[PDB]
Every structure is written in structure tokens, then in C-alpha cells.
CSV table of C-alpha atoms and ligand atoms in Angstrom, one decimal:
chain,number,residue,atom,x,y,z
K,1356,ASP,CA,86.7,-33.4,27.0
K,1357,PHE,CA,89.5,-31.4,29.1
K,1358,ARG,CA,91.8,-32.5,30.8
K,1359,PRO,CA,93.1,-32.2,34.5
K,1360,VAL,CA,95.6,-29.2,35.3
K,1361,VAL,CA,98.1,-29.2,38.3
K,1362,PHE,CA,99.9,-25.9,39.0
K,1363,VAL,CA,102.7,-25.8,40.7
K,1364,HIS,CA,103.9,-22.2,42.7
K,1365,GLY,CA,107.1,-20.7,43.1
K,1366,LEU,CA,108.9,-19.5,46.1
K,1367,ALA,CA,106.9,-18.2,49.7
K,1368,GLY,CA,103.9,-18.9,47.2
K,1369,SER,CA,100.7,-20.8,47.5
K,1370,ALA,CA,97.3,-21.8,45.4
K,1371,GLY,CA,96.9,-19.0,45.8
K,1372,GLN,CA,98.3,-17.6,42.6
K,1373,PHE,CA,96.1,-20.5,40.3
K,1374,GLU,CA,92.7,-19.4,42.2
K,1375,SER,CA,91.6,-16.3,39.6
K,1376,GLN,CA,92.6,-18.8,36.9
K,1377,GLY,CA,90.8,-21.8,38.1
K,1378,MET,CA,87.7,-20.1,38.4
K,1379,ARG,CA,88.0,-19.0,34.8
K,1380,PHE,CA,88.8,-22.1,33.8
K,1381,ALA,CA,85.6,-23.6,35.3
K,1382,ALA,CA,83.6,-20.3,33.9
K,1383,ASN,CA,85.0,-22.3,30.3
K,1384,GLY,CA,83.7,-25.5,30.7
K,1385,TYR,CA,86.3,-27.0,32.9
K,1386,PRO,CA,85.0,-29.3,35.6
K,1387,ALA,CA,86.0,-27.0,38.6
K,1388,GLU,CA,87.7,-30.5,40.4
K,1389,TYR,CA,89.6,-30.9,37.0
K,1390,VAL,CA,92.2,-28.0,38.6
K,1391,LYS,CA,94.3,-29.3,41.1
K,1392,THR,CA,96.6,-27.4,42.7
K,1393,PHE,CA,99.9,-28.9,44.8
K,1394,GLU,CA,101.8,-27.3,47.8
K,1395,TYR,CA,104.9,-28.0,49.0
K,1396,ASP,CA,107.4,-26.7,51.2
K,1397,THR,CA,109.3,-23.9,49.7
K,1398,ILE,CA,111.9,-23.0,52.5
K,1399,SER,CA,112.9,-26.6,52.6
K,1400,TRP,CA,112.7,-26.8,48.7
K,1401,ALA,CA,114.5,-24.0,47.9
K,1402,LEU,CA,117.6,-24.3,50.5
K,1403,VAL,CA,118.0,-28.1,49.8
K,1404,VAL,CA,117.4,-29.1,46.1
K,1405,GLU,CA,117.7,-25.3,44.3
K,1406,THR,CA,121.0,-24.8,46.1
K,1407,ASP,CA,122.6,-27.6,43.8
K,1408,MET,CA,124.0,-26.5,40.4
K,1409,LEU,CA,121.7,-27.6,38.1
K,1410,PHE,CA,120.6,-24.2,37.5
K,1411,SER,CA,123.8,-22.9,39.5
K,1412,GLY,CA,121.2,-21.7,42.2
K,1413,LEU,CA,119.0,-19.8,40.2
K,1414,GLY,CA,115.9,-21.3,41.4
K,1415,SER,CA,117.1,-20.5,45.5
K,1416,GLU,CA,117.7,-17.0,45.0
K,1417,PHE,CA,114.3,-15.3,47.2
K,1418,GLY,CA,114.3,-18.2,49.4
K,1419,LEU,CA,118.0,-17.2,50.6
K,1420,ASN,CA,116.9,-13.7,50.8
K,1421,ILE,CA,113.8,-14.6,53.0
K,1422,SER,CA,115.8,-17.4,55.1
K,1423,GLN,CA,117.2,-14.5,56.8
K,1424,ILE,CA,115.0,-14.9,59.8
K,1425,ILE,CA,115.1,-18.1,60.8
K,1426,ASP,CA,116.4,-19.2,63.7
K,1427,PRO,CA,120.0,-21.0,64.1
K,1428,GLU,CA,119.1,-24.1,65.3
K,1429,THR,CA,115.9,-24.3,63.1
K,1430,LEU,CA,118.3,-23.4,59.8
K,1431,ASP,CA,120.4,-26.1,60.4
K,1432,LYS,CA,117.7,-28.4,61.0
K,1433,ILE,CA,116.5,-27.5,56.9
K,1434,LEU,CA,119.8,-27.8,56.4
K,1435,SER,CA,120.5,-31.3,57.4
K,1436,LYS,CA,117.8,-33.2,55.1
K,1437,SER,CA,118.8,-35.1,52.3
K,1438,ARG,CA,118.3,-33.5,49.3
K,1439,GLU,CA,117.8,-37.1,47.0
K,1440,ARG,CA,115.3,-37.6,50.3
K,1441,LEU,CA,113.7,-34.1,49.9
K,1442,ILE,CA,113.5,-34.7,46.1
K,1443,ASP,CA,112.0,-38.4,45.8
K,1444,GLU,CA,109.6,-38.0,48.8
K,1445,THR,CA,108.0,-34.6,47.1
K,1446,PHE,CA,108.0,-35.9,43.4
K,1447,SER,CA,106.4,-39.5,44.7
K,1448,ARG,CA,103.7,-36.6,46.2
K,1449,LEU,CA,103.0,-35.3,42.9
K,1450,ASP,CA,102.8,-39.0,41.6
K,1451,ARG,CA,99.5,-39.4,43.8
K,1452,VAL,CA,98.5,-36.1,42.8
K,1453,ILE,CA,98.7,-36.5,39.4
K,1454,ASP,CA,97.5,-40.4,38.7
K,1455,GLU,CA,94.7,-39.5,41.1
K,1456,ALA,CA,93.5,-36.6,38.8
K,1457,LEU,CA,93.7,-38.8,35.7
K,1458,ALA,CA,91.5,-41.8,37.2
K,1459,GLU,CA,89.1,-39.2,38.2
K,1460,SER,CA,89.1,-37.8,34.9
K,1461,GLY,CA,89.7,-40.8,32.8
K,1462,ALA,CA,92.3,-38.2,30.7
K,1463,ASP,CA,95.3,-40.0,29.3
K,1464,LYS,CA,98.0,-37.0,30.5
K,1465,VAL,CA,97.3,-33.6,32.6
K,1466,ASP,CA,99.2,-30.3,32.2
K,1467,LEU,CA,101.2,-29.1,34.4
K,1468,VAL,CA,101.8,-25.3,35.2
K,1469,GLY,CA,104.9,-23.8,37.2
K,1470,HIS,CA,105.5,-20.2,38.7
K,1471,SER,CA,108.3,-18.9,39.6
K,1472,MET,CA,110.2,-21.2,41.6
K,1473,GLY,CA,107.7,-23.4,40.5
K,1474,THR,CA,108.8,-23.7,36.7
K,1475,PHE,CA,112.7,-25.0,38.3
K,1476,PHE,CA,110.7,-27.9,40.6
K,1477,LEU,CA,108.7,-29.1,37.3
K,1478,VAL,CA,111.1,-29.4,34.7
K,1479,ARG,CA,113.3,-31.2,37.5
K,1480,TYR,CA,109.8,-33.3,37.5
K,1481,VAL,CA,109.7,-34.1,34.3
K,1482,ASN,CA,113.0,-34.8,33.6
K,1483,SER,CA,113.2,-37.1,36.3
K,1484,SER,CA,112.1,-40.7,34.9
K,1485,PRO,CA,110.4,-41.3,31.1
K,1486,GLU,CA,107.6,-41.9,33.4
K,1487,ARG,CA,106.8,-38.9,34.9
K,1488,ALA,CA,107.1,-37.3,31.5
K,1489,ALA,CA,104.8,-39.2,30.1
K,1490,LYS,CA,101.9,-38.6,31.7
K,1491,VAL,CA,102.0,-34.5,30.6
K,1492,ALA,CA,100.3,-33.3,27.6
K,1493,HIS,CA,101.9,-29.6,27.9
K,1494,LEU,CA,104.1,-27.9,30.2
K,1495,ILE,CA,103.5,-24.0,31.1
K,1496,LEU,CA,106.8,-22.8,33.0
K,1497,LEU,CA,105.6,-18.8,34.0
K,1498,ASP,CA,108.1,-16.6,34.4
K,1499,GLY,CA,110.6,-18.6,36.1
K,1500,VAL,CA,113.4,-20.4,34.2
K,1501,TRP,CA,115.3,-19.5,31.2
K,1502,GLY,CA,118.7,-20.4,29.3
K,1503,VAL,CA,117.6,-24.1,29.3
K,1504,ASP,CA,115.9,-26.5,26.8
K,1505,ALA,CA,112.2,-27.6,26.8
K,1506,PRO,CA,111.9,-31.0,28.3
K,1507,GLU,CA,112.0,-33.5,25.7
K,1508,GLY,CA,109.1,-34.6,23.6
K,1509,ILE,CA,106.9,-32.6,25.7
K,1510,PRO,CA,105.1,-29.4,23.4
K,1511,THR,CA,106.3,-26.5,26.0
K,1512,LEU,CA,105.1,-22.8,27.0
K,1513,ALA,CA,107.4,-20.5,28.7
K,1514,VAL,CA,105.9,-16.6,29.4
K,1515,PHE,CA,107.5,-13.8,30.8
K,1516,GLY,CA,106.9,-10.7,32.2
K,1517,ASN,CA,109.6,-7.7,32.7
K,1518,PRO,CA,112.3,-8.5,34.6
K,1519,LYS,CA,112.8,-5.6,36.3
K,1520,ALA,CA,110.6,-7.0,38.7
K,1521,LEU,CA,113.1,-9.8,39.6
K,1522,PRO,CA,116.4,-9.5,40.9
K,1523,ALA,CA,118.7,-7.7,38.2
K,1524,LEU,CA,122.0,-8.1,38.9
K,1525,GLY,CA,122.4,-11.1,36.2
K,1526,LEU,CA,122.5,-9.7,32.6
K,1527,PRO,CA,119.7,-11.8,30.4
K,1528,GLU,CA,119.4,-10.1,27.0
K,1529,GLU,CA,116.8,-12.3,26.6
K,1530,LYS,CA,114.4,-15.3,28.5
K,1531,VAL,CA,114.0,-18.4,26.4
K,1532,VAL,CA,113.4,-22.1,27.1
K,1533,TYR,CA,114.7,-23.4,23.8
K,1534,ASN,CA,112.5,-25.2,21.7
K,1535,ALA,CA,109.6,-23.9,23.5
K,1536,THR,CA,106.4,-21.5,22.3
K,1537,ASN,CA,107.7,-18.6,24.3
K,1538,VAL,CA,105.6,-15.5,24.9
K,1539,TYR,CA,106.5,-11.8,26.1
K,1540,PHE,CA,104.6,-9.9,28.3
K,1541,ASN,CA,106.4,-6.9,29.1
K,1542,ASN,CA,104.4,-5.1,30.9
K,1543,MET,CA,103.3,-7.3,33.4
K,1544,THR,CA,105.2,-8.4,36.8
K,1545,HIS,CA,106.1,-11.4,38.3
K,1546,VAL,CA,103.0,-12.6,40.1
K,1547,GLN,CA,100.9,-10.4,38.0
K,1548,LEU,CA,101.9,-12.7,34.9
K,1549,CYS,CA,101.0,-15.9,36.9
K,1550,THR,CA,97.1,-14.5,37.6
K,1551,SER,CA,96.4,-13.0,34.8
K,1552,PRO,CA,93.3,-12.6,32.5
K,1553,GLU,CA,95.6,-12.4,29.0
K,1554,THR,CA,97.9,-15.3,31.0
K,1555,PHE,CA,94.8,-17.6,31.0
K,1556,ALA,CA,94.1,-16.4,27.6
K,1557,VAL,CA,97.4,-18.1,26.4
K,1558,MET,CA,97.6,-21.0,28.5
K,1559,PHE,CA,93.9,-22.1,27.7
K,1560,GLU,CA,94.9,-22.1,23.9
K,1561,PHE,CA,98.1,-23.4,23.7
K,1562,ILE,CA,96.5,-26.7,26.2
K,1563,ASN,CA,92.9,-26.4,24.2
K,1564,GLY,CA,94.1,-25.3,20.0
K,1565,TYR,CA,91.5,-22.8,20.5
K,1566,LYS,CA,90.8,-19.6,22.8
K,1567,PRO,CA,88.8,-19.7,25.8
K,1568,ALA,CA,84.9,-17.8,24.9
K,1569,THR,CA,85.4,-15.8,28.3
K,1570,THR,CA,88.8,-14.5,30.2
K,1571,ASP,CA,86.0,-12.7,32.6
K,1572,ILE,CA,85.5,-14.8,36.3
K,1573,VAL,CA,81.7,-15.3,35.2
K,1574,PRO,CA,79.6,-15.4,38.4
K,1575,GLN,CA,76.9,-18.9,38.3
K,1576,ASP,CA,73.5,-19.2,37.9
K,1577,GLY,CA,72.1,-19.5,42.1
K,1578,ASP,CA,72.5,-17.5,45.4
K,1579,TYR,CA,75.0,-20.1,46.8
K,1580,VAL,CA,79.1,-20.6,46.5
K,1581,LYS,CA,80.6,-23.9,47.3
K,1582,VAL,CA,84.4,-22.8,49.2
K,1583,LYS,CA,87.0,-24.9,49.7
K,1584,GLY,CA,89.9,-23.7,51.1
K,1585,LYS,CA,93.0,-23.6,53.8
K,1586,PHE,CA,94.5,-22.1,56.5
K,1587,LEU,CA,98.2,-22.9,56.2
K,1588,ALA,CA,101.5,-21.2,57.0
K,1589,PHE,CA,103.3,-18.9,54.7
K,1590,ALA,CA,105.7,-20.1,52.5
K,1591,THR,CA,106.2,-23.8,54.1
K,1592,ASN,CA,102.6,-24.5,53.6
K,1593,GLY,CA,101.7,-26.5,56.4
K,1594,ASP,CA,98.2,-27.0,57.6
K,1595,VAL,CA,97.1,-24.7,60.3
K,1596,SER,CA,95.5,-25.4,63.1
K,1597,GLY,CA,92.5,-23.4,64.6
K,1598,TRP,CA,89.5,-22.1,64.8
K,1599,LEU,CA,86.9,-19.9,61.9
K,1600,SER,CA,84.3,-17.8,62.7
K,1601,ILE,CA,82.7,-16.6,59.9
K,1602,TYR,CA,80.3,-13.2,59.8
K,1603,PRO,CA,78.2,-11.9,56.6
K,1604,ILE,CA,79.2,-7.8,56.9
K,1605,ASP,CA,77.7,-4.7,55.5
K,1606,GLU,CA,79.7,-2.5,53.2
K,1607,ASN,CA,81.0,-0.9,56.5
K,1608,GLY,CA,82.3,-3.9,57.9
K,1609,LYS,CA,79.7,-4.8,60.6
K,1610,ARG,CA,78.5,-8.4,61.4
K,1611,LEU,CA,75.3,-8.4,60.2
K,1612,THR,CA,74.8,-11.4,62.5
K,1613,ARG,CA,75.6,-11.9,66.4
K,1614,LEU,CA,76.8,-15.2,66.1
K,1615,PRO,CA,78.8,-16.6,63.1
K,1616,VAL,CA,77.1,-18.2,60.3
K,1617,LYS,CA,80.0,-20.3,59.9
K,1618,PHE,CA,81.9,-21.7,63.1
K,1619,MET,CA,84.7,-24.6,63.0
K,1620,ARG,CA,88.0,-25.8,64.4
K,1621,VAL,CA,90.0,-26.2,60.9
K,1622,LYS,CA,93.2,-28.0,60.6
K,1623,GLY,CA,94.5,-26.8,57.4
K,1624,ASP,CA,91.3,-27.4,55.4
K,1625,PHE,CA,87.5,-26.5,55.4
K,1626,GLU,CA,84.5,-26.3,53.2
K,1627,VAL,CA,81.7,-24.1,53.5
K,1628,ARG,CA,78.9,-22.7,51.4
K,1629,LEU,CA,78.2,-19.4,51.0
K,1630,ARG,CA,76.2,-16.8,49.5
K,1631,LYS,CA,77.0,-15.4,46.2
K,1632,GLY,CA,77.8,-11.4,46.2
K,1633,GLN,CA,77.8,-11.0,49.9
K,1634,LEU,CA,80.5,-9.4,51.9
K,1635,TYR,CA,82.0,-12.2,55.1
K,1636,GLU,CA,84.5,-11.2,57.8
K,1637,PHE,CA,86.6,-14.5,58.2
K,1638,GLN,CA,87.3,-14.7,61.5
K,1639,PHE,CA,90.3,-16.7,62.5
K,1640,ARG,CA,92.3,-17.8,66.2
K,1641,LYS,CA,95.2,-19.5,65.4
K,1642,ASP,CA,96.1,-21.9,68.6
K,1643,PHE,CA,98.5,-20.5,70.5
K,1644,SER,CA,98.9,-17.3,69.8
K,1645,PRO,CA,96.7,-14.2,71.5
K,1646,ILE,CA,95.9,-12.6,68.6
K,1647,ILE,CA,92.4,-12.5,66.7
K,1648,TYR,CA,92.6,-12.3,62.4
K,1649,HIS,CA,90.0,-10.7,60.5
K,1650,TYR,CA,90.4,-11.6,57.1
K,1651,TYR,CA,88.7,-9.6,54.6
K,1652,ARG,CA,88.2,-9.8,50.2
K,1653,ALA,CA,85.7,-9.4,47.2
K,1654,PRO,CA,82.4,-11.2,47.5
K,1655,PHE,CA,82.9,-14.8,45.6
K,1656,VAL,CA,81.1,-14.7,42.9
K,1657,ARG,CA,81.2,-18.4,41.8
K,1658,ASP,CA,82.8,-21.9,43.4
K,1659,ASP,CA,86.5,-21.4,44.3
K,1660,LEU,CA,88.1,-24.5,45.4
K,1661,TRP,CA,91.2,-22.6,45.6
K,1662,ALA,CA,91.0,-20.1,48.3
K,1663,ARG,CA,94.4,-19.7,51.0
K,1664,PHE,CA,93.9,-17.5,53.9
K,1665,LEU,CA,98.1,-17.4,54.7
K,1666,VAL,CA,99.2,-16.9,58.5
K,1667,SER,CA,102.4,-16.9,60.2
K,1668,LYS,CA,104.2,-19.4,62.1
K,1669,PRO,CA,107.2,-20.7,63.1
K,1670,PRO,CA,110.0,-21.2,61.0
K,1671,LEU,CA,109.3,-18.3,59.1
K,1672,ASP,CA,107.8,-16.6,61.7
K,1673,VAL,CA,107.0,-12.9,59.5
K,1674,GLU,CA,104.3,-11.7,62.0
K,1675,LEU,CA,107.2,-11.3,64.2
K,1676,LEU,CA,108.6,-8.2,62.7
K,1677,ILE,CA,106.0,-6.0,63.5
K,1678,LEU,CA,106.3,-7.3,67.2
K,1679,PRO,CA,108.1,-4.7,68.8
K,1680,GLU,CA,105.1,-2.1,67.5
K,1681,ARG,CA,102.5,-4.6,68.8
K,1682,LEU,CA,103.6,-5.1,72.5
K,1683,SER,CA,103.6,-0.8,72.5
K,1684,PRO,CA,101.3,1.4,74.5
K,1685,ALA,CA,100.1,2.5,70.6
K,1686,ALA,CA,99.1,-0.5,69.5
K,1687,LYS,CA,96.0,-0.4,72.3
K,1688,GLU,CA,94.7,2.5,69.8
K,1689,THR,CA,96.2,2.4,66.7
K,1690,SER,CA,95.6,-0.6,63.5
K,1691,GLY,CA,97.8,-2.6,61.7
K,1692,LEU,CA,97.3,-4.1,58.3
K,1693,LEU,CA,98.6,-6.7,56.0
K,1694,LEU,CA,97.3,-6.0,51.9
K,1695,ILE,CA,97.7,-8.7,50.0
K,1696,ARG,CA,97.5,-8.2,45.9
K,1697,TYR,CA,99.1,-11.5,43.9
K,1698,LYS,CA,99.6,-8.6,41.1
K,1699,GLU,CA,102.6,-6.3,42.2
K,1700,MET,CA,101.2,-2.9,43.6
K,1701,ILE,CA,103.3,-0.4,42.1
K,1702,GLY,CA,104.6,3.0,42.9
K,1703,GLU,CA,106.7,3.6,40.8
K,1704,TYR,CA,106.2,4.9,37.1
K,1705,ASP,CA,108.0,2.7,33.7
K,1706,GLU,CA,107.0,3.8,30.5
K,1707,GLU,CA,107.1,-0.5,29.9
K,1708,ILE,CA,105.2,-1.2,32.5
K,1709,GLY,CA,102.5,1.6,32.0
K,1710,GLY,CA,101.0,2.9,34.5
K,1711,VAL,CA,101.1,3.1,38.6
K,1712,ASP,CA,98.8,1.6,41.5
K,1713,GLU,CA,97.6,3.7,44.1
K,1714,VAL,CA,96.4,2.1,47.0
K,1715,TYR,CA,94.8,4.3,49.8
K,1716,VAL,CA,94.4,4.0,53.4
K,1717,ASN,CA,91.9,6.0,54.9
K,1718,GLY,CA,93.0,9.0,52.1
K,1719,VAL,CA,96.4,8.2,52.0
K,1720,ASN,CA,98.0,7.4,49.4
K,1721,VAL,CA,100.9,4.5,50.7
K,1722,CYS,CA,101.7,2.6,47.0
K,1723,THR,CA,104.8,5.2,47.0
K,1724,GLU,CA,107.5,5.6,44.8
K,1725,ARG,CA,109.4,4.8,47.7
K,1726,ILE,CA,107.1,2.2,49.5
K,1727,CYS,CA,106.5,0.3,46.2
K,1728,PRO,CA,108.9,0.0,43.7
K,1729,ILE,CA,109.0,-1.9,40.6
K,1730,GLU,CA,112.3,-3.9,41.8
K,1731,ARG,CA,110.7,-5.0,45.4
K,1732,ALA,CA,107.2,-6.7,43.2
K,1733,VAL,CA,105.2,-5.7,46.1
K,1734,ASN,CA,102.3,-8.3,46.7
K,1735,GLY,CA,101.7,-7.9,50.4
K,1736,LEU,CA,102.0,-4.6,51.8
K,1737,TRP,CA,102.0,-4.2,56.1
K,1738,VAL,CA,100.7,-0.7,57.1
K,1739,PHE,CA,101.8,-0.2,60.5
K,1740,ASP,CA,103.0,2.9,63.0
K,1741,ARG,CA,106.7,1.9,62.8
K,1742,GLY,CA,108.5,2.9,65.7
K,1743,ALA,CA,104.8,3.1,67.7
K,1744,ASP,CA,105.2,6.8,67.4
K,1745,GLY,CA,102.3,8.6,66.8
K,1746,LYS,CA,103.6,9.4,63.6
K,1747,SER,CA,102.9,8.8,60.0
K,1748,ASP,CA,106.8,8.8,58.0
K,1749,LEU,CA,106.0,7.4,54.8
K,1750,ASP,CA,109.3,9.0,52.9
K,1751,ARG,CA,111.2,6.6,55.9
K,1752,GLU,CA,111.5,3.1,54.3
K,1753,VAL,CA,110.8,0.5,57.3
K,1754,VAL,CA,114.1,-1.5,56.7
K,1755,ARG,CA,113.3,-4.7,58.0
K,1756,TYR,CA,111.2,-5.8,55.0
K,1757,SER,CA,114.0,-4.8,52.9
K,1758,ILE,CA,115.2,-8.2,52.1
K,1759,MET,CA,111.5,-10.0,52.1
K,1760,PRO,CA,110.9,-10.9,48.7
K,1761,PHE,CA,107.6,-9.4,47.6
K,1762,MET,CA,106.8,-7.4,50.3
K,1763,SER,CA,107.3,-3.7,51.1
K,1764,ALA,CA,105.8,-1.9,54.4
K,1765,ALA,CA,104.5,1.7,55.4
K,1766,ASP,CA,104.3,4.1,58.2
K,1767,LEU,CA,101.0,5.3,58.0
K,1768,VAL,CA,99.1,5.8,61.9
K,1769,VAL,CA,96.0,4.5,61.4
K,1770,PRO,CA,93.5,5.1,64.5
K,1771,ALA,CA,91.8,1.9,65.8
K,1772,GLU,CA,88.9,4.2,66.0
K,1773,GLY,CA,85.5,3.7,64.2
K,1774,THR,CA,86.5,2.2,60.6
K,1775,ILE,CA,89.1,2.1,57.8
K,1776,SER,CA,88.4,3.0,54.7
K,1777,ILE,CA,91.0,1.1,51.7
K,1778,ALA,CA,90.8,1.4,48.2
K,1779,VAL,CA,92.9,0.4,45.8
K,1780,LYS,CA,92.8,2.3,41.8
K,1781,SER,CA,94.5,-0.2,39.9
K,1782,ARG,CA,97.0,0.4,37.4
K,1783,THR,CA,95.2,-1.8,34.8
K,1784,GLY,CA,91.8,-0.2,35.7
K,1785,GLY,CA,89.2,-0.3,38.0
K,1786,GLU,CA,89.2,0.5,41.7
K,1787,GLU,CA,88.2,-2.2,44.5
K,1788,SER,CA,87.7,-0.5,48.0
K,1789,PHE,CA,87.1,-1.9,51.6
K,1790,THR,CA,85.3,0.1,54.9
K,1791,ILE,CA,86.4,-2.0,57.7
K,1792,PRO,CA,85.9,-1.5,61.2
K,1793,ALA,CA,89.4,-0.2,63.3
K,1794,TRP,CA,90.0,-3.5,65.4
K,1795,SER,CA,93.5,-2.5,67.8
K,1796,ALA,CA,96.0,-3.9,66.7
K,1797,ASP,CA,97.1,-5.4,70.7
K,1798,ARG,CA,94.8,-8.0,69.7
K,1799,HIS,CA,93.8,-7.7,66.1
K,1800,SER,CA,95.2,-8.5,63.0
K,1801,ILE,CA,93.7,-7.3,59.9
K,1802,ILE,CA,94.7,-9.2,56.5
K,1803,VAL,CA,92.9,-7.4,53.2
K,1804,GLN,CA,93.1,-9.2,49.7
K,1805,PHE,CA,92.6,-7.0,46.5
K,1806,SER,CA,91.6,-8.8,44.1
K,1807,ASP,CA,94.3,-9.6,41.4
K,1808,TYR,CA,91.6,-8.3,38.5
K,1809,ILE,CA,89.1,-6.0,38.6
K,1810,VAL,CA,86.8,-6.2,35.3
K,1811,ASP,CA,85.5,-2.2,35.4
K,1812,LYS,CA,82.4,-1.4,33.1
K,1813,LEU,CA,83.2,1.7,31.9
K,1814,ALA,CA,87.0,1.1,31.4
K,1815,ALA,CA,86.3,-1.6,29.1
K,1816,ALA,CA,84.0,0.1,27.3
K,1817,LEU,CA,86.8,2.8,26.5
K,1818,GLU,CA,89.1,0.5,25.1
K,1819,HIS,CA,86.1,-1.2,22.9
D,554,MG,MG1,98.8,-29.8,21.8
D,555,MG,MG1,67.5,-17.0,41.2
D,556,MG,MG1,105.2,5.7,62.9
């Protein structure tokens, strides 16, 4: 019998970094409900908690950077929170999740997995009391804390990627969690490490004692899948209110039904039954905003209980960064996109990584060495007409994003006429392409989520 696994994301992260992994666990026999995700406000956590000296402030670095855009009065309110109180509140909520999971499954202990800042969070959590540590069969720490001992008596696995994808003004000649089994994937980058099928295999074997029969997201039988998802605020992860309209679409992004096949008021959570292998447009209207959001992604092939749709909201309203252009005349005639992949898009070649991604928008590669260098760990690439001047200047950095963790931007004019072609040729092999309507930036925002792994028949065969 499998025991539940509970995943704790990092700064500016969410359940999305464990979506693929949850589906791999289920493909290998785990009831899908046994894979839990614990979400929390990462801005308050990084600034209030991880700025202490337990780890000499290491767990807070990306939070310090991303916080630059917070309004002064709001920042002060955030920093005024009691640190001991935030900790006890958040940790008590994880106790509840773990206790409910043990009762639901009948298991005696759970496996806990943390990514990046989530590893700092979990080391504090298990060391906070013997009762908390007692409920953990295995602890997995992905590309986060290092130079510390594994919590006493808890079998710990630490998996590390290439440090070039993280801030390097520090000098770790090696990252090790003492007394843990340490595994290294030097050809992988920060978030990629969290979502990789190779990481999946190492984790499954560590906690189960045998290699999984497959690391593929195996499609399930039948024509329908259950999807449980949430619309939540980027980085702070609070539930977001709005209206969800789902439309099945063709290969060119045209809606196949006049009316949406699902229409609902949402407050964070939502659950829907959809057709397996079908392309959908998830249209979202958030309360109090005039923009209509159109979310695109590959079809679902099995139940997915961890889908996440990110929404820009205060205090960290990152979308405000593209407001000047959205308010310009060119917005009526040009589109604005956010391309997301939880596996760094890399345009700079490094022999250790071994290859570069190519990301084409209307036939132009925006994943260049200047826009997607390895050190920026690009998981979110904003594509819009910077300056609203009708000129593409890919060689000139879009400076406003330089300090934003995991994001970059490309100044490319995308005509809001007809459709937009978007394709990624993955550095690890395979390609995924989308053709969608060219919604104008004045009224619409377009979010395209690339899959974090592509299994290509020919490439797999060539390797075999
Ligand atoms: Mg064991
Ligand atoms: Mg059938
Ligand atoms: Mg421009």
C-alpha cells in the first residue's frame, strides 16, 4: 500500500510544480488523491521567516528580489507580521493536511517533498517538534537548502541541479545535505529538476524501494478526465474570484461551441469533467479587472488534481509591469503573451546543460542567449511590443524584468490579426506547438503553458 506524499513548493511556486509528478505517481498505482500539495503565501514566508539567521538568510534571496515591486505601505504591513505567529499558523495548517491524509489513506506516515524555498520550510517544519517528525517516513529536498544535516532519524534524499541556474555570488564547491542520500543532475536546471521524469524515478524508488514501471504520464482508459484546479494569486497563492468559461477549440484555436461547455463562478477551486485529448481554451474574467484572460495548454490525458492557473493580484501585481504598453494605441492592434514552462527555457549554450530550447512565436525564436540566459532560470517569458512602437528589438533587454525571479521578456510585435503560432523545440527533445487567436492586448491577455516534458516517439526510439 502506498502512503501519501505531500509537496511544498518554493518562492513564487505552487502545486503546478508537482502536477506532472502527481500524474506520474498515479500512473504507477497511487490513488491520485494520495498526492497532496501544501500551498502558502511565499512573499510573507520569504520576507518574514526566511530572513532570520537559521540558514543565514539563504532561503529568502528570491523573495527579496521579487518584493521590489510591492507598494511601500503594503510591504510594511507584510513585514509587521509576527514571525513566531506566521510559523505556528502555517505549520499548524500543514499538520492538518498531513493528519487528514493519514486518516484518508490509513497510512501511519507520509512522505514530504519540498522544492527550493520549500526545503527550508520543511527542514524547519520537521525539526520544530518530535511529533511532526514522527509522521514523516521520508523527506525529499529538491535543489534548495544545503550545508545542513538531514533531520535526525528521517531518511532524507536531496537532489541537486546545476547551480548556474541560481544566484552565484556565493561559493559552494559542492551542495550536500549531511547524512542524506544526495543525488546530482548537473544537466538540469532549478524548476526542471522539480518536474523531471528522472527526478520522479529517483524519488519513487527512494520512498518505495523499487523503480517505477514507468515515468510517462500514461493516458487513462475512457474518453473523459477529472480536472481539479485553482485560480490563485501568483506568489501569494490566495484564492482568486472570477468567472470561468471553458471552450473546446480546434487546432487553430477556434471555439468549437458557440457557448462554453463549462461556465462557473469560481473562488479559487474548481472541478470539471473534460474530454481526454481535446484542446481547450480556459477563459477567465477576474473580478474588478477589464481584461479577459485566455489560458491555453496541451490536452489532459488522465485525471489531473493539481492544475493551476496563475493570476496577477496585489500585493505582487506583476502584470502592472506591462500596463504602459497595454494602455497605448498599439495595444488595439497587437497581442501580448506570457509563455510558461516549469522547466527553464534556455537560449544560452553550456556543455553541462547540453542543449538549448528554441521558442518560436510567428516563426521568430524568442529564446535567445540574451533573453533566456541560464542564470535567469526562465520559467515565464513575457512576449509583447515593449515601447508600443511597432518595432521588434530582441537584442535590447526589457529591463523592467531583470530582477524578477524566473522571468524574462522579449520585445516582439505580434499582430492582433488572425492567429498566433507558438512552438517550443525542447532542449531535451520533442516539440509542442499551439496556434491560437491573436487577441488584442487592449482587452485580452494570453497565457500559454508549455508541457514540462515531451515524450517524442522518434527521439525515444533513436536513444533506444
Ligand atoms: Mg524507506
Ligand atoms: Mg473506449
Ligand atoms: Mg517594441
